Write an enzyme that holds these catalytic residues in place. Structure first.
Site, PDB file in Angstrom:
ATOM      1  N   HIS A 135       3.167  11.137   5.793  1.00 47.41           N
ATOM      2  CA  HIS A 135       2.364  11.166   6.863  1.00 47.41           C
ATOM      3  C   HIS A 135       3.198  10.886   7.877  1.00 47.41           C
ATOM      4  O   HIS A 135       3.564   9.600   7.738  1.00 47.41           O
ATOM      5  CB  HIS A 135       1.135  10.188   6.575  1.00 47.41           C
ATOM      6  CG  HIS A 135      -0.074  10.878   5.815  1.00 47.41           C
ATOM      7  ND1 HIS A 135      -1.003   9.824   5.285  1.00 47.41           N
ATOM      8  CD2 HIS A 135      -0.205  12.295   5.368  1.00 47.41           C
ATOM      9  CE1 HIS A 135      -1.750  10.770   4.374  1.00 47.41           C
ATOM     10  NE2 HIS A 135      -1.547  11.992   4.683  1.00 47.41           N
ATOM     11  N   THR A 162      -7.066   7.038   6.814  1.00 51.06           N
ATOM     12  CA  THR A 162      -7.250   7.067   5.432  1.00 51.06           C
ATOM     13  C   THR A 162      -7.349   5.795   4.595  1.00 51.06           C
ATOM     14  O   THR A 162      -7.540   5.533   3.525  1.00 51.06           O
ATOM     15  CB  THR A 162      -6.391   8.121   4.633  1.00 51.06           C
ATOM     16  OG1 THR A 162      -5.170   7.511   4.537  1.00 51.06           O
ATOM     17  CG2 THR A 162      -6.299   9.416   5.143  1.00 51.06           C
ATOM     18  N   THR A 163      -6.614   4.578   5.443  1.00 52.27           N
ATOM     19  CA  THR A 163      -6.699   3.145   4.896  1.00 52.27           C
ATOM     20  C   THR A 163      -7.700   2.467   6.003  1.00 52.27           C
ATOM     21  O   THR A 163      -7.897   2.760   7.138  1.00 52.27           O
ATOM     22  CB  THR A 163      -5.400   2.981   5.152  1.00 52.27           C
ATOM     23  OG1 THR A 163      -4.883   2.886   6.282  1.00 52.27           O
ATOM     24  CG2 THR A 163      -4.348   3.322   3.850  1.00 52.27           C
ATOM     25  N   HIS A 187       0.742  -1.206   0.194  1.00 52.26           N
ATOM     26  CA  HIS A 187      -0.076  -0.031  -0.268  1.00 52.26           C
ATOM     27  C   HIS A 187       0.804   1.426   0.157  1.00 52.26           C
ATOM     28  O   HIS A 187       0.444   1.981  -0.681  1.00 52.26           O
ATOM     29  CB  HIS A 187      -0.975   0.043   1.080  1.00 52.26           C
ATOM     30  CG  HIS A 187      -1.791  -1.176   1.088  1.00 52.26           C
ATOM     31  ND1 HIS A 187      -1.623  -2.240   2.193  1.00 52.26           N
ATOM     32  CD2 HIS A 187      -2.873  -1.676   0.432  1.00 52.26           C
ATOM     33  CE1 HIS A 187      -2.360  -3.148   1.889  1.00 52.26           C
ATOM     34  NE2 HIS A 187      -3.116  -3.096   0.917  1.00 52.26           N
ATOM     35  N   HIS A 246       1.883   8.864   0.179  1.00 57.21           N
ATOM     36  CA  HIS A 246       0.956   8.642  -1.051  1.00 57.21           C
ATOM     37  C   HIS A 246       1.133   9.296  -2.288  1.00 57.21           C
ATOM     38  O   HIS A 246       1.660  10.399  -1.962  1.00 57.21           O
ATOM     39  CB  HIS A 246      -0.488   9.418  -0.339  1.00 57.21           C
ATOM     40  CG  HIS A 246      -0.886   8.543   0.872  1.00 57.21           C
ATOM     41  ND1 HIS A 246      -1.440   7.260   1.111  1.00 57.21           N
ATOM     42  CD2 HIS A 246      -0.595   8.828   2.086  1.00 57.21           C
ATOM     43  CE1 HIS A 246      -1.717   6.874   2.304  1.00 57.21           C
ATOM     44  NE2 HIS A 246      -1.230   7.737   3.122  1.00 57.21           N
ATOM     45  N   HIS A 295       5.073   7.378   6.149  1.00 54.54           N
ATOM     46  CA  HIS A 295       4.784   6.660   4.890  1.00 54.54           C
ATOM     47  C   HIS A 295       4.242   7.719   3.901  1.00 54.54           C
ATOM     48  O   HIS A 295       3.996   8.914   4.378  1.00 54.54           O
ATOM     49  CB  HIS A 295       3.551   5.559   5.048  1.00 54.54           C
ATOM     50  CG  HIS A 295       2.307   6.141   5.551  1.00 54.54           C
ATOM     51  ND1 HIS A 295       1.942   6.049   6.863  1.00 54.54           N
ATOM     52  CD2 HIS A 295       1.191   6.734   4.741  1.00 54.54           C
ATOM     53  CE1 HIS A 295       0.623   6.671   7.044  1.00 54.54           C
ATOM     54  NE2 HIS A 295       0.155   7.176   5.608  1.00 54.54           N
TER      55      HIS A 295
END
Ligand SMILES: NS(=O)(=O)c1cc(C(=O)NCCCO)c(Sc2ccccc2)cc1Cl
Ligand SMILES: NS(=O)(=O)c1cc(C(=O)NCCCO)c(Sc2ccccc2)cc1Cl
Ligand SMILES: NS(=O)(=O)c1cc(C(=O)NCCCO)c(Sc2ccccc2)cc1Cl
Ligand SMILES: [Zn+2]
Ligand SMILES: [Zn+2]
Lengths: 251, 251
Positions: free
Chosen positions: B111, B192-193, B60, B88, B86
């Site tokens: 994040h 958000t996951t 992810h 995005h 992490h």
């Protein structure tokens, strides 16, 4: 623990020596105007007469235990359940509110204690950010008898004895608070009694509620406390903000 | 679960259908200036070269495990410890930030996930208000190779395959973040996951960080995800505010 003296509260609970304690002195001209702060919303506070509620002299205050289903939101996604309400007061010619405004101490104060819907119990919420929320209103002397407060003040005689309780009919709990839920101060603090755990969201209403002089004498003059002393001056000394900002819902 | 496909996230985790989800579209126009919002405090983020840190392709995102000792405060007595960070990102010619500003999606987003120090464990913090806090910054295209991001991007090669991982030398985590710690948006939302738990305090820096066009290409084009598919466009759609007001630390 006692109001009046020993044992020091920090010996009872270390958190009573925390940096971020309640109550505080509110200086409105110093509060930060925070347009995010929307009007408070209450559901389920208009109780029918049955089932009855327990009203107890616990030796520290008079506490009305509330039933399940009283919902309060500080805002969207900031959801609480009402647990209980209690009062802080003084003595003849001595005011006893916990919060002060520009150093002014009001005759008395009501607290409605709420638990965040993310926690099953008070002991899991203690010390957690926003775990508990208190709605606080000043009680002032007015010309008129307050018919809402009379429902409780007319019962104080039955629970004069420390550790006494009686059952009273359900009533409109929101009628014990001011009608304006849009104008308030908000800050992060603690329990004002041991164990003085931090992470409590305090909402103090701009508008006060009026009791009659005799209603306020009833509150301060009926109940007995520990040892053989009157239950009076049951308020904590103002605690420093220590860098906390008080927010206001109004410019 | 996976990005752009099936299963529907509410089938994996019904919490994904909550009313106070992340990410959101920020309209600085409609943000409330909250003067109480103080500059962010980040201590212990300047890590020494050893011990090394785990960097993992989890399918992810690329996730860097942070050691104990990274302390963060959002305000007085509101303290956090950093767990991991992490990113995005999008694809060749397509922006992949999770948050958006007035509808604009930025190339990428970082994040930094923290646990409230009022909770001994992450599993206690999930679903609790303020249990988790994320610091989010948008990554933009600049003319210069970013030195900070180079330490992570140069190692994406070593972990291109879903589930592969590598040890990296310690770096200054604070150098991955924008210049001004006094200027940010804040609101309460969700992971958000999946499992999309609510109670997450989101702090989104006003200012961006800059990576070279090449650096952004490395991020979006090196990693492989679920099946035989590239790890790209690993962001969630923006979610309705449902009455939440975004706060700003700046007028
Ligand atoms: N009288 S009270 O202020 O209202 C109250 C309520 C609760 C409570 O957690 N749960 C009921 C709410 C369910 O919606 C507890 S918990 C507890 C903690 C230590 C020791 C024993 C019990 C304690 C009190 Cl003092
Ligand atoms: N004044 S306050 O910050 O609003 C407050 C008071 C009490 C409380 O009921 N204290 C005893 C005096 C009043 O009944 C409680 S809950 C509790 C705690 C310890 C012991 C028993 C109950 C929670 C709060 Cl947030
Ligand atoms: N986007 S996010 O809101 O910031 C987010 C993402 C992830 C996450 O790692 N998802 C997989 C993709 C990135 O590695 C976690 S992980 C976690 C940590 C503590 C508790 C529960 C979950 C937490 C958050 Cl807040
Ligand atoms: Zn109280
Ligand atoms: Zn993320």
């Amino acid at each position: 623990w006692r109001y009046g003296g020993d044992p020091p509260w920090p010996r009872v609970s270390p958190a009573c020596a925390g940096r971020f304690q309640s109550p505080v002195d509110i200086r409105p001209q110093l509060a930060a105007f925070s347009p995010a702060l929307r009007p408070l919303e209450l559901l389920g506070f208009q109780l029918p007469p049955l089932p009855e509620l327990r009203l107890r002299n616990n030796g520290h205050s008079v506490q009305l235990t509330l039933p399940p289903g009283l919902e309060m939101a500080l805002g969207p996604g900031r959801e609480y359940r009402a647990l209980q309400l209690h009062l802080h007061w003084g003595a003849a010619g001595r005011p006893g509110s916990e919060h002060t405004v520009e150093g002014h101490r009001f005759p008395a104060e009501i607290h409605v204690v709420h638990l965040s819907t993310a926690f099953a119990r008070v002991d899991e919420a203690l010390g957690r950010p926003g775990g508990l929320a208190v709605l606080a209103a000043f009680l002032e002397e007015g010309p008129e008898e307050n018919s809402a407060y009379e429902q409780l003040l007319s019962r104080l005689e039955e629970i004069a004895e420390e550790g006494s309780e009686t059952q009273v009919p359900g009533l409109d709990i929101s009628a014990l608070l001011p009608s304006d839920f849009s104008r308030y101060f908000q800050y992060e603090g603690s329990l004002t009694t041991p164990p003085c755990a931090q992470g409590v969201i305090w909402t103090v209403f701009n508008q006060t509620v009026m009791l009659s002089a005799k209603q306020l004498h009833t509150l301060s003059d009926t109940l007995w406390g520990p040892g053989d002393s009157r239950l009076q001056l049951n308020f904590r000394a103002t605690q420093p903000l220590n860098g906390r900002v008080i927010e206001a819902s109004f410019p």
